[PDB]
A and B are shown apart, each in its own frame.
Chain A
Amino acid sequence: VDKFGIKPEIHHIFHAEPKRVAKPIAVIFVLIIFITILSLIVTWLNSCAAAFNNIPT
């Protein structure tokens, strides 16, 4: 009884899209990085001395 009757339907099974983190956590970390950049930029100008003495003339 080969290839004489209707055949069972086949459906492809797909994979899953990788999970992305919730935007609140990413926003928190982006804020941490921004604060770190600001702290560096102010450590240069405050505790450390970026004199800006010899501006060319």
Chain B
Amino acid sequence: DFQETFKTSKRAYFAQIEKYPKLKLIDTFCFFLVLLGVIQCTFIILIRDNFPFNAFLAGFIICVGQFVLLMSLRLQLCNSFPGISKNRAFAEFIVASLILHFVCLHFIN
């Protein structure tokens, strides 16, 4: 059952990431964006304190936000939406990313 769908999906996935090179860049980025969030959470646990809560959140949310924007890009890039082309779906991504980076550099103070 599950142990079979596992190989099936792994096959499909690696096939796609090899066929299209760019769909690996985003994936690598997303993987590391997880790690950084985990590192921050581990810090919060290792010290059992979250004194700069503004700072902690500004550092965790920039990762969550970048992850979700990358996934929106990967979905708009694997199968384009009706009125948005691959280009416009990269410029929109850039604008949203820049806005996120600003509000996050304003939150940490």
Residues of A participating in the B interface, judged by any CB pair closer than 8 Å: 18-21, 25, 29, 32-33, 36, 39-40, 43-44, 48-51
Contacts and interface: CB of A to CB of B under 8 A. Distances in A.
- For chain B, the bracket of interface size reads 10 to 19
Interface in B26-69: 28-29, 32, 35-36, 39, 43, 46-47, 49, 51
Q: What does DSSP make chain B's interface, helix, strand, loop or mixed?
A: helix
Contacts of A29: 39, 43
Contact of A36 (B21, B25, B32): B32
A34 to B, nearest CB: 11
29 contacts: A18-B49, A18-B51, A19-B49, A19-B51, A20-B51, A21-B47, A21-B49, A25-B46, A25-B47, A29-B39, A29-B43, A32-B39, A33-B36, A33-B39, A36-B32, A36-B35, A36-B36, A36-B39, A40-B28, A40-B29, A40-B32, A43-B28, A43-B32, A44-B25, A44-B28, A48-B24, A49-B21, A49-B24, A50-B25
Interface of B: 21, 24-25, 28-29, 32, 35-36, 39, 43, 46-47, 49, 51
Contacts of A43: 28, 32
Contacts of A36: 32, 35-36, 39
Given A29-B39, A29-B43, 10 more contacts: A18-B51, A21-B49, A25-B47, A33-B39, A36-B35, A36-B39, A44-B25, A44-B28, A48-B24, A48-B25
